[PDB]
Structure 1
Amino acid sequence: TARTAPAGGEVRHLKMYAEKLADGQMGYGFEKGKASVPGPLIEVNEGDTLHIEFTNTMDVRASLHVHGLDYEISSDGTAMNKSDVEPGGTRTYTWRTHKPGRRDDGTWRPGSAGYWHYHDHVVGTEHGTGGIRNGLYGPVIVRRKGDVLPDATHTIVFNDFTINNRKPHTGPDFEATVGDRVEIVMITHGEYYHTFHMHGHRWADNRTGILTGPDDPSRVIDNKITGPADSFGFQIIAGEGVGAGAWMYHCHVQSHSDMGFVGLFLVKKPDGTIPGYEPHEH
């Protein structure tokens, strides 16, 4: 009786741009002039095909490389396989997804479903080190039929020391009301390992971050080590068993949190108030 994903299998078309931003960053967007860091969420159902008409509006070569989804070598997004895009150029990248199922040999083919991500592979170096650092990364979600759908999805990227390329002490913060079903996509990039920690909430360390029932032995956690290009996701009920509050999330590596890269999960009562949080003190 929660909302759930339907069966997939449609062909989808989408336009994407890589742009240099006024402050020197680089971002992806669905419209020229509306690039963001992280780039926009792409969400499909297992079985869907996605044709991305990608335009590089920058003055250097750029590409689009995706984790997890099915792509032929011509949509690798690498210079080696001649899959990047010249300045001002356009290229159609195709990502496919499949449902799980029994193979002819009796084995089980896993589906595409999961929390994934896309990023540049040619800016700065042949592994996209400069593009990733500048902001060319974004999330991808592939739903299995029957997966629970959230009220809202927030993307948190640990990129080197930053969260979502933001300066220390600037969040990002996310807001919810007690009881909302909130989804988090958690991606890591760059040079360092991290440990993602969330106060007041916990999730299962498995594909969906949710336990299906009493037979799932997955660890329930509130702290998870991650490294460059790791992605996972989960859903929580905001404030469940703990109430409204300004619930911190941050990397738990002590020098990293001490740098001031922290955010708040601001869980409100219906009247918008948050116990112990005065907005004028923030």
Structure 2
Amino acid sequence: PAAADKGGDVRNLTLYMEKLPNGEMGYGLRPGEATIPGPLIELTEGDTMNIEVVNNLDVAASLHVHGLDYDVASDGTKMNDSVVQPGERRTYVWRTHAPGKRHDGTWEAGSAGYWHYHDHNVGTEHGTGGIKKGLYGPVVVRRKGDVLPDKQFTVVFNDMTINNRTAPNTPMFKAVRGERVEFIVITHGDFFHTFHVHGHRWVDNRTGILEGPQDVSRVIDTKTTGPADSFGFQVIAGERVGAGHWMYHCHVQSHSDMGMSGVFMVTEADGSVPG
């Protein structure tokens, strides 16, 4: 499979904060194309992201990132004068680094991992209104050499929803058996959830992939996750289990009974699927 190259490229992005139908709010790559979740931002350790944020909501809003290197001017908080007025723009800057030894001989871990960005100013100074209405999105930082997937699926447990949907309206994620599928799982709001996937499992380490014979991490198919936890992993879809309608859901019983579930549909190469 394809592996990430060395990082160290300065990359420019624009995000638009747009109103969506029914009082929702989303980040978008073009005006009028906001989605919930926001677009996935992917980079490799050592890259820099210059992200111009265009605020087309009616309230001051912001952009806050987990995991990455940013100074207080990109903190995304009113407290650090880091918000965006309606109709105005602002550039937020995310740096990353790769792991390495400090002068004093101790190791600095790298930025690589599964992270996320969200609003930190709509509703409350902690972004509670903005997050509730959909202002959140995934971030993937690769380490040089990390294995790369064919499909990326984002699951955000936001209160009692997946990606602001419940019911049967939760996203279905389609893949062909044998494809390298990468899940990114972020939680938001006021509740704790357990993420679970039928028919698949992963390693509870940085990448979700076994690192080698001396990797000692738990292999799991269920993970407790609270507001602003983020993790991710990669699976071979259908490995050892075949195609089919493979449920993903929150395993808290009343939550899944209230629609915190969807389908990971693994299909044969011709599109067929048992069911």
TM over 0.5: yes
What is the correspondence of 1:64-75 to structure 2 with a 5 Å cutoff? 64-75=63-74
- Percent identical among aligned pairs is 68
4+ residue segments displaced more than 6 Å: none
What is the correspondence of 1:14-53 to structure 2 with a 5 Å cutoff? 14-53=13-52
What's 1:268 paired with?
267
Alignment partners' CA distance in 2, 1:34 and 1:84 = 22
Q: CA deviation at 1:167?
A: 3.0
Alignment partners' CA distance in 2, 1:13 and 1:172 = 29
Post-superposition Cα deviations, 1:58-108, rounded to whole Å, max 9, x if no partner, equal 111000000000001000000001100111110010000001001110100
What is the correspondence of 1:251-262 to structure 2 with a 5 Å cutoff? 251-262=250-261
Contact 2:3 2:146 in 1 (8 A): yes
Post-superposition Cα deviations, 1:102-143, rounded to whole Å, max 9, x if no partner, equal 111010000000000000001000000000000000000000
Letter of the 1:106 counterpart: G
Contact 1:169 1:261 in 2 (8 A): no
The DSSP-based 3-state class of the residue aligned with 1:80 is: helix
What is the correspondence of 1:11-160 to structure 2 with a 5 Å cutoff? 11-160=10-159
Q: CA deviation at 1:23?
A: 2.1
Alignment partners' CA distance in 2, 1:242 and 1:187 = 26
What's 2:177 paired with?
178
Alignment partners' CA distance in 2, 1:128 and 1:42 = 20
Contact 2:248 2:261 in 1 (8 A): yes
Alignment partners' CA distance in 2, 1:114 and 1:232 = 8
Q: What is the TM-score when the length of structure 1 is the normalising length?
A: 0.96
Q: Please provide the CA RMSD for this pair.
A: 0.7
Post-superposition Cα deviations, 1:11-39, rounded to whole Å, max 9, x if no partner, equal 10111110111321000011100000000
Alignment partners' CA distance in 2, 1:148 and 1:10 = 19
Q: Which structure 1 segments of 5+ residues have no match?
A: 278-282
Alignment partners' CA distance in 2, 1:54 and 1:231 = 23
What's 1:168 paired with?
167
Alignment partners' CA distance in 2, 1:159 and 1:236 = 24
What's 2:192 paired with?
193
Post-superposition Cα deviations, 1:210-250, rounded to whole Å, max 9, x if no partner, equal 01111000000000000000000000000000111100010
The DSSP-based 3-state class of the residue aligned with 1:77 is: coil
Contact 2:162 2:170 in 1 (8 A): yes
Alignment partners' CA distance in 1, 2:6 and 2:25 = 35
Alignment partners' CA distance in 2, 1:4 and 1:270 = 24
Q: What is the TM-score when the length of structure 2 is the normalising length?
A: 0.99
Alignment partners' CA distance in 2, 1:241 and 1:207 = 23
The DSSP-based 3-state class of the residue aligned with 1:15 is: strand
Alignment partners' CA distance in 2, 1:234 and 1:58 = 34
Letter of the 2:101 counterpart: R
Q: CA deviation at 1:171?
A: 2.1
The DSSP-based 3-state class of the residue aligned with 2:35 is: coil
Alignment partners' CA distance in 2, 1:87 and 1:267 = 43
The DSSP-based 3-state class of the residue aligned with 1:218 is: coil
